[PDB]
A paper describes a structure:
ID30A-3 (or MASSIF-3) is a mini-focus (beam size 18 µm × 14 µm) highly intense (2.0 × 1013 photons s−1), fixed-energy (12.81 keV) beamline for macromolecular crystallography (MX) experiments at the European Synchrotron Radiation Facility (ESRF).
The transmitted white beam then impinges on a liquid-nitro­gen-cooled single Si(111) crystal with a bandwidth of 1.5 × 10−4 used as a monochromator for MASSIF-3, which delivers a beam at a photon energy of 12.812 keV into its experimental hutch (EH2). This energy on the high-energy remote side of the selenium edge was chosen in order to be able to use the anomalous scattering contribution from selenium for de novo phasing experiments. Data were measured according to a strategy proposed by an EDNA characterization at 100 K from a crystal cryo-protected using Paratone N and were automatically processed.
Residue numbers in the entry: 16 to 297
């Protein structure tokens, strides 16, 4: 892997959509938190070794979907992850698919359950960079923790960002805008105030947004992206060795996981290299 400054949309080869012999294990989990008893899936990379430490990426489904959608026949994201890790395009990581369904949970308020229940449950059981899952242990491993999502799950992602910068450094909002404001500048300012309160430097948080040029999400995302670009908090470029903000728009892509899985193929290899604990040249 090498960073590009303006990475372009490129679908995974069609071969990546079929099962790979080097298949990561997908574990169905059940936990109880502030929204009652709920499930999530945990993708473990092929060769997962609990004596090693893995990057972790939490990835939210869209409206009318559930914690099983992303690894279902409708999406098959695990095949793409399996092929990309096997081919060395993507460093091995843990991918979690939770749900905003259940109890008092909504796409907007999921971050509260994420903080209190989901991180402690997943990262007590599986080997992340978290030494412990106290607030301190989670915060001290933030550079190795990412959140993303599609549509309503992209809205989850923006609310995770504004409320969880202490816990998460890498954000992948796909086809979803941040509902918090009466203008694009209010949206940008809300994110800027979150960043100000966090104390973090511009080198300590990263946003790879994406959508399709034929995805309705573009209408509200693009103005938000333009307003954020104007902030001093963001240096626009996909080269995260130099800046921290990018917006990939896939030509012709519609509001459909068939396209959105390719955004994760394009974007997820960009994550978790800044202050990484390996000696890599990107």
């Amino acid at each position: 892997f090498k960073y590009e400054s303006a990475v372009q949309y490129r679908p995974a080869p069609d071969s990546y959509l079929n099962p790979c012999p080097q298949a990561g294990r997908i574990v169905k989990e059940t936990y109880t938190g502030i929204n009652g008893t709920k499930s999530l899936n945990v993708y473990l990379p092929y060769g997962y070794d609990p004596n090693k430490k893995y990057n972790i990426f939490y990835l939210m489904h869209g409206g009318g979907e559930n914690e099983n959608t992303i690894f279902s026949n409708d999406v098959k994201l695990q095949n793409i992850l399996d092929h990309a890790i096997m081919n060395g395009e993507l460093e091995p990581l843990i991918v979690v698919t939770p749900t905003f369904n259940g109890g008092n949970c909504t796409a907007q308020n999921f971050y509260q359950e994420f903080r209190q229940n989901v991180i402690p449950f997943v990262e007590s059981k599986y080997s992340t960079y978290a030494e412990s899952t106290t607030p301190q242990g989670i915060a001290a491993s933030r550079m190795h923790r990412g959140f993303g999502g599609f549509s309503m799950g992209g809205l989850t992602t923006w609310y995770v960002m504004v409320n969880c910068l202490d816990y998460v450094a890498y954000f992948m909002p796909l086809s979803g805008d941040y509902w918090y404001g009466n203008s694009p500048q209010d949206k940008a300012n809300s994110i800027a105030e979150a960043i100000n309160r966090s104390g973090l430097s511009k080198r300590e948080y990263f946003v790879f947004a994406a959508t399709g040029s034929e995805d309705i999400a573009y209408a509200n995302m693009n103005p938000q992206i333009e307003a954020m670009k104007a902030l001093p908090h963001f240096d626009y470029t996909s080269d995260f060795s130099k800046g921290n903000f990018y917006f990939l728009v896939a030509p012709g892509a519609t509001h459909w996981w068939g396209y959105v899985r390719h955004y994760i193929y394009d974007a997820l290899p960009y994550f978790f290299h800044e202050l990484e604990h390996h000696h890599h040249h990107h």
